[PDB]
Amino acid sequence: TQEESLKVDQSANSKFVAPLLDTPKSVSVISKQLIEDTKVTTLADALRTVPGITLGAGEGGNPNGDRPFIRGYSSESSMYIDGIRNSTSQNREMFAVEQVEVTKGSASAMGGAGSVGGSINMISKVAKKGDFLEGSVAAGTDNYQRITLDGNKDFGNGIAARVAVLGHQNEKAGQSNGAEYKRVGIAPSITFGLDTPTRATLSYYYLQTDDKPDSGIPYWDSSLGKAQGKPAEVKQGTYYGWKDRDFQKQENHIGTIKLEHDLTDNITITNTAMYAKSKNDYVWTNPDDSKGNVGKGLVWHRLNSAITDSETFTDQLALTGKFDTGFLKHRFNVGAEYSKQKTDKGGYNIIDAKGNVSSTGFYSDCSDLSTNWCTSLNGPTQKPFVDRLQARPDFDATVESTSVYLLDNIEITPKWLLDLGLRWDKFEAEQNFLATSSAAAYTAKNNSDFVTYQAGITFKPTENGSIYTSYATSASPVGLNAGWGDNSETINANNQMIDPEEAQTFEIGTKWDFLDNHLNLTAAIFRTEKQNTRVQIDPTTYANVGESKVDGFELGLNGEITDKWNISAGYTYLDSELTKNGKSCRSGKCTDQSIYNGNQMPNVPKQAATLWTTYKVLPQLTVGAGAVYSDKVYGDVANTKWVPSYVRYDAMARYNVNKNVDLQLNINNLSDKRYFTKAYASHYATEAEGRSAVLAVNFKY
């Protein structure tokens, strides 16, 4: 069946009005079958299958959740759930996810603000026709246990209801007395009017976590005695967090009402209303914060924290369908959107027994260990936290947007398709800051309005082939993180009046369905760039004079090579350049970065590739193998802090016990490679999980 294919022909996003073969834009789909084969449980893990998507890390001024970079540009503020932005900081789960669609290239005409290098859209499982009950019970090394249940009941009168439930725990693999994850979720929905002209779907999503959060490995260069170079040479799986102090609790609720009416057999009006509540409460450890203790065999437990509470309402109204004038065939989506988000943000003060207060920590010089503020670089041991944390409010933030767009793919003849999109956005961000020890209370506000677009031509040499050229723009206003997120987007007194950043993608490509439509190959060559980047000029002045660009190549191959052999593979070459830099400022002092003009962009590898392939060795036995490769990744503009290249292997075996029951073994990071998945701009990098195994009993009725 098609549900079992690694090749996905159509996007579930109704803003992609044409099949992916004929769409003049790069789109990768992390398919249902790939998700099942790999047993990825988080978006972050899932993204490892897409080469060149690099993950970013948190620090003092930005949260430590999902931070995907696409073609060199952060998509943290451009993460979508069924086409609606939901970009509060979260570690997103896969339990209610059908597939993940990664748009690569500038895409504001489809998504509004952001989408500079691309965007991610997670497609949810929802109630549908046909009865079924599916489940998984699994156990794995390092105290992994996971149970999921997914039941769908078709009442046979156009009504169906579905619920997925999740219970999950694991320790980070290979990291003893280290990070720990626990979470529970539920996702019930009900749909009405199946197979009729008038339809309604009510859905709810809930996920709640209770974790001991990861730390990282500090950068160190022994020759220089400085916090730079590669991560310190310490034992694999070393944890520098402070388990008695550190924690992270996330809680997310999403409620959606979607109403559809078919005005004709070819034109549908849809209204989607989404209500989201998102909380994040955390304390985690930066290993040494570049204080130099590493060179004396010690690590200071620098504290990073935040407490956020966000509520968002979004409504999208879209008219979709097709109209054939006789000469031209239009495939369209025209619409309007409104959203409003409000966020409260605070963090933690640390108070010692004498009443001293800090937001960062005590004894950063490791002069006194009696309250356990530093640990051993080699063989750290977990100790009590004996100071006190106290919640402290910092600011609130309100983002309101309104937009209208037209998307139309015009078939001129069966060989010629003209793709068009045009969108107008109005954006307002307002942030009210409480007084601090160094500044009075103030309000920052940005108002931006901007038009973005896309234009492409697709030529089809045959019905199974496409060759295209396209151009698309993006705009990214200050304050886009809506209070807490990517720190490059944070609004303040001095940038609040600045116009949006401007980006664009020029792409040429080709796509082909082969082997009786069992295989799809894609190739693209592009320049994705931010030709107007916001940069700092001095400690209290900004301007839009920066520039960067990524010249790249992407190749993708998905589907069935034979009726026993399938494949999902990708390659990318990314030649990135920080063409024109501003200054780096800290505590009133700015360092000029023009000396780094021409450097490689951080958080992007020059090359990367992934491969997943499976073979039906017996009719009841499938075996899978994967490889993930990345070149080295820089953390900083100066290109002095980095993590090395790596290859990571995976394997799988699935045995069909009977028609309803499978046993599936996954071995992850099969060679137990020590590598790093995130490189922060300073201080540290995040180690990838070590080797693990998971064994599951999967059922399907």
Ligand X SMILES: CCCCCCCCOCCOCCOCCOCCO
> Which residues of this chain interact with ligand X, rule CB under 6 A?
253, 255, 275, 277, 311-313, 340, 342, 404-406, 422, 424, 449-451, 457, 459, 461-462, 467-469, 508, 510
Beta-carbon contacts of residue 602 (< 8 Å; ≥ 6 apart): 633, 634, 635, 636, 637, 639, 679, 681
Q: Which DSSP category does 391 fall into?
A: E
- Choose between 422 and 651: whose C-beta lies nearer to ligand X: 422
**Contact call for residues 25 and 470 (beta carbons, < 8 A):** yes
**264 or 413, CB closer to ligand X?**
413
Residue 289 tokens, joined: 């914060």
Nearer to ligand X, 200 or 455 (CB): 455
Q: Which two tokens stand for residue 209?
A: 């976590």
Q: Report which residue's Cβ sits closest to ligand X.
A: 275
Q: Residue 553 in 3-state DSSP?
A: strand
How far apart are CB 501 and ligand X at their closest, in Å? 15
In 415-488, where do the E strands start and end?
416-433, 442-459, 465-476
Query: Residue 246 or 507: which CB sits closer to ligand X?
Result: 507
Quote the CA–CA distance of 685 and 129 in Å, as a whole number. Answer: 46
d(CA 249, CA 302) in angstroms, rounded, equals 19
- 42 burial (CB, 10 Å; 0-12 / 13-18 / 19+) is middle
Find the shortest distance in angstroms from Cβ 416 to ligand X: 9
CA 352 to chain centroid: 37
Q: Which is nearer to ligand X, 404 or 543 (CB)?
A: 404
State the minimum distance, in angstroms, from the CB of residue 255 to ligand X: 4
Label residues 556-570 b or e (16+ Cβ within 10 Å = b).
bbbbbeeeeebbbbb
Contacts of 588 (CB under 8 A, 6+ apart): 539
The residue (of 121 and 343) whose beta carbon lies closer to ligand X is 343
State the maximum Cα–Cα separation within the chain, in Å, rounded to a whole number. 83
Minimum CB–partner distance for residue 202 and ligand X (Å): 12
Question: In whole angstroms, how close is the CB of 62 to ligand X at the nearest point?
Answer: 23
Q: In the 8-state DSSP scheme, what is residue 172?
A: P
**Any bridge partners for residue 617, and if so which?**
none
**Backbone torsions φ then ψ of 582, nearest 5 degrees:** -95, -135
d(CA 273, CA 253): 14
Burial-class residue 415 by CB neighbours within 10 Å (0-12, 13-18, 19+).
middle
In whole angstroms, the minimum distance from the beta carbon of 409 to ligand X comes to: 14
Instruction: Considering the complex, state which of residue 31 and residue 448 has its C-beta at the smaller distance from ligand X.
Output: 448
Closer Cβ to ligand X, 161 or 336, answer by number = 336
Least distance to ligand X from the beta carbon of 126, Å? 17
Smallest distance from ligand X to CB 457, Å: 4
CB of 687 to ligand X, least distance (A): 35
Start-to-end CA distance of the chain, whole Å, equals 16
Quickly tell me which residue has 């609040």 as its tokens. 496
DSSP bridge pairs for 637: none
Beta carbon of residue 469, minimum distance to ligand X (angstroms, whole number): 4
Angle at 213 between CA 611 and CA 116, to 5 degrees: 55
> How does strand 298-324 pair with strand 267-287?
antiparallel
Nearer to ligand X, 445 or 580 (CB): 445
* Smallest gap from residue 553 Cβ to ligand X (A): 12
Nearer to ligand X, 424 or 629 (CB): 424
- Length of the chain measured in residues: 701
Closest CB 162 distance from ligand X, rounded Å = 19
* 468/571 with CB nearer ligand X: 468
CB nearer to ligand X: give 457 or 567: 457
What burial class does residue 551 get, using C-beta atoms within 10 Å of its C-beta: 0-12 exposed, 13-18 middle, 19+ buried?
Answer: middle
